[PDB]
Amino acid sequence: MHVLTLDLAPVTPKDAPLLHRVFHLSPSYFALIGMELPTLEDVVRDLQTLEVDPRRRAFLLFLGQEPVGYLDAKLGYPEAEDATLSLLLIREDHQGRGLGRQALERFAAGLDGVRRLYAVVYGHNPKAKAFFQAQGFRYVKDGGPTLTWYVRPL
Q: Which residues are near Cl ion by CB under 5 A?
A: 3-5
The nearest distance, CB 21 to ligand ACO, in angstroms, is 15
Judged by CB under 6 A, the chain residues 107 through 126 that form the site for ligand ACO are 119-121, 125
The option from ligand ACO, Cl ion, none interacting with 96 (CB < 5 to 8 A, set by class) reads ligand ACO
Alpha-carbon distances, residue 17 vs 22, 65, 79, 118, 138 (angstroms): 9, 14, 33, 29, 35
Phi, psi of 36 (to 5 degrees): -65, 160
For residues 87 and 121, is the Cβ–Cβ distance under 8 A? no
CB nearer ligand ACO, residue 14 or residue 138 = 138
Contact 80, 31 (CB under 8 A): no
DSSP state of 95: T
Per-residue interface string for the shown chain with ligand ACO, residues 70-109, x marking contact by CB under 6 A: ---------------x-xxxx----xxxxxxx--------
Number of H helices, E strands in the chain: 5, 7
Question: Smallest distance, Å, CB 51 to ligand ACO?
Answer: 21
Annotated binding residues for acetyl-CoA, written as ranges, equal 88, 90, 96, 98, 100-101, 125
